Design a protein around this ligand. Structure first.
Ligand SMILES: C[C@@H](SC(=N)N)c1ccc(Cl)cc1
Ligand SMILES: C[C@H](SC(=N)N)c1ccc(Cl)cc1
Ligand SMILES: [Br-]
Length: 330
């Protein structure tokens, strides 16, 4: 089997991407944030505290003939950005782009934090990291990809995120028309539960490539590119007037600037992030100070190749017995 679904930016800055997902019988379609940095499939639901729902589409398990309460199971997750959610668990039929999993754990939110309430466009998350990170207790549950894997034509999914445009998540096959050149594969460590890999270095604009190992995670659920302070300082030093602002919480730059590209290494290959991908717009409405898309990972504890980086590439999440990641230009 295979599946193929379009993923769409939630706003004009590509702050996140939503992908339609069918849950239950008859189908209830919710727009979920596919997140390779977590491993819970959770949804706004008929059980979510009413004051914490503001425009999201909800899953109502009582209206699904295939929903079954997973007795005694609860979940609670807090994303390293400070947001959080928690609730109880059903199993139900879940389909993405024509690929169906029966008995998928669907985590129904009873509580969500304010940042979720305040985002009416995201109806939940679909985790695609390794199932060892799944928070369901007392019986940990498998991700959609892990449940689907043995049925797939090939045990892979691919992320092809667009810049200010829709893109695609594919399951079970590699669309050879969706990238240029070849796919370069690189080793993954699963020890922390993430798609963790080591970039071989970077370049700023037309500058020379610096060979240096940068350990990080491939995280579709993070908007920006978080890299060591040395690398980020070298990048922003090429932008007249850019500075790190403690009051704003990162590097900002004059909205009148044209930004240089940023290149990262994948083995001997190179992925080029165009400068425009690094512009996240005014820090507040009407401001001429713009927020940067490359920020320091100091204090996160890991580097994060978020959407800014991933959208410059066609990315293969290879879930074979020994997982690997693949990157191609596009
Ligand atoms: C791994 C992601 S959270 C996710 N993808 N669900 C993350 C952790 C910590 C920080 Cl500070 C920022 C991002
Ligand atoms: C999964 C990501 S966490 C991240 N951006 N690193 C997320 C999405 C929406 C909200 Cl409101 C909070 C967190
Ligand atoms: Br300002």
């Amino acid at each position: 089997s295979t599946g193929s679904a379009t993923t769409t930016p939630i706003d004009s800055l590509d702050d996140a991407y939503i992908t339609p997902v069918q849950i239950g019988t008859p189908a209830q379609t919710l727009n979920l944030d596919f997140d390779t940095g977590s491993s819970d499939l959770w949804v706004f639901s008929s059980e979510t505290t009413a004051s914490e729902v503001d425009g999201q589409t909800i899953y109502t398990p009582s209206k699904s003939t295939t929903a079954k309460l997973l007795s005694g199971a609860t979940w609670s997750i807090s994303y390293g950005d400070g947001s959080s959610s928690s609730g109880d668990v059903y199993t139900d039929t879940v389909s993405v782009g024509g690929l169906t999993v029966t008995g998928q754990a669907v985590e129904s939110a009873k509580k969500v934090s304010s940042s979720f309430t305040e985002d009416s466009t995201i109806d939940g998350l679909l985790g695609l990291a390794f199932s060892t990170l799944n928070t369901v207790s007392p019986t940990q549950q498998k991700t959609f990809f892990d449940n689907a894997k043995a049925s797939l034509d090939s045990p892979v999914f691919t992320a092809d995120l667009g810049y200010h445009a829709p893109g695609t998540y594919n399951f079970g096959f590699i669309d050879t028309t969706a990238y240029t050149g070849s796919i370069t594969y690189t080793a993954v460590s699963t020890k922390q539960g993430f798609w963790e890999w080591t970039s071989t270095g970077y370049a700023v604009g037309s500058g020379t490539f610096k060979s240096t190992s940068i350990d990080g995670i491939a995280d579709t659920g993070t908007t920006l590119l978080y890299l060591p302070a040395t690398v980020v300082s070298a990048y922003w030093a090429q932008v007249s007037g850019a500075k790190s602002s403690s009051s704003v919480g990162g590097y900002v730059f004059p909205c009148s600037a044209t930004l240089p590209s940023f290149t990262f290494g994948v083995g001997s290959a190179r992925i080029v992030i165009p400068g425009d991908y690094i512009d996240f717009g005014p820090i507040s409405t009407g401001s001429s100070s713009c927020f940067g898309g490359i920020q320091s990972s100091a204090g996160i504890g890991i580097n994060i190749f978020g959407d800014v980086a991933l959208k410059a590439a066609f990315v293969v999440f290879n879930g074979a017995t020994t997982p690997t990641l693949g990157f191609a230009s596009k």
